[PDB]
Amino acid sequence: AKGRTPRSFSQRYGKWNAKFTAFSNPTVASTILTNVAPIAQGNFQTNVPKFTSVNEQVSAVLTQYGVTGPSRAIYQGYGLKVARALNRIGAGPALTNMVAGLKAYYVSAYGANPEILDAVTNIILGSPTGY
DNA sequence: ATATATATATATATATATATATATATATATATATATATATATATATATATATATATATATATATATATATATATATATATATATATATATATATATATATA
């Protein structure tokens, strides 16, 4: 019972503003954050290593291909996207569909190189196509 | 008449706390007139070096607190578009049971 009736801009703004004002209270914010601190630490600890490893390995791959500067961000981003999919739905035909869709996305919108996208996918999933 | 605590009249001696008239000496706290030296706290005239707290002119690197231009990922507080489930505080459509005013 959260997204059942349509909300106009005034309703969204009113509720977002009420909640932002409530959270700015010292007691409210301190209580909520001190209560969710251990769970946040646990979620960070279980999830971030999988992505720091991807950062390191895609860096290694990008240095061998001569990519420098902000153009590295492109492929780094691509890598993280693929890793996200692997963390979300697992390996199988769905991951294959998403890898193909992400390659199409990046090649068509950001002018990425298909060879380096294959190289990043090979270092992450084990093969260029990801099977 | 004797012992004690005091004030006197008359000269003198001894010990102590002070003020003088006369010159000199010693130790101490100071202010001066005349040059010079030593240690200490400062302000200067002239160049230079060392350590420290800052502001600059010119490029570059490192750590920290923030704002960006560009796509992406992770944790956190929220508002949405679409259907579904769990826990909690409510109001209803329909009959029924239990506890309470």
Side-chain angles (χ1 to χ4, degrees):
Chain A
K2 193 75 169 185
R4 291 187 161 194
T5 64
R7 297 282 209 262
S8 67
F9 165 74
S10 49
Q11 307 178 264
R12 296 187 204 191
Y13 180 65
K15 208 180 177 196
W16 173 90
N17 199 27
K19 294 299 272 286
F20 197 90
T21 300
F23 193 63
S24 309
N25 199 278
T27 304
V28 172
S30 66
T31 300
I32 292 181
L33 291 175
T34 314
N35 270 268
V36 305
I39 304 98
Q41 295 165 0
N43 290 327
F44 203 85
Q45 287 168 355
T46 59
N47 284 283
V48 173
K50 309 167 188 173
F51 292 85
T52 56
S53 176
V54 170
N55 268 339
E56 296 173 355
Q57 291 189 318
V58 185
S59 184
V61 164
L62 286 180
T63 300
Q64 311 173 358
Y65 278 81
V67 179
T68 45
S71 291
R72 284 175 82 103
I74 301 176
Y75 306 99
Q76 284 287 349
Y78 173 79
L80 293 172
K81 202 93 169 286
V82 169
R84 176 173 166 241
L86 188 60
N87 202 32
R88 179 74 257 181
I89 70 186
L95 186 67
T96 306
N97 296 345
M98 279 199 74
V99 164
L102 292 175
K103 287 188 63 175
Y105 179 31
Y106 263 77
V107 162
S108 295
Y110 305 124
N113 202 329
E115 293 180 355
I116 310 177
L117 286 185
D118 294 354
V120 183
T121 313
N122 178 90
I123 203 60
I124 294 172
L125 290 187
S127 66
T129 48
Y131 297 176

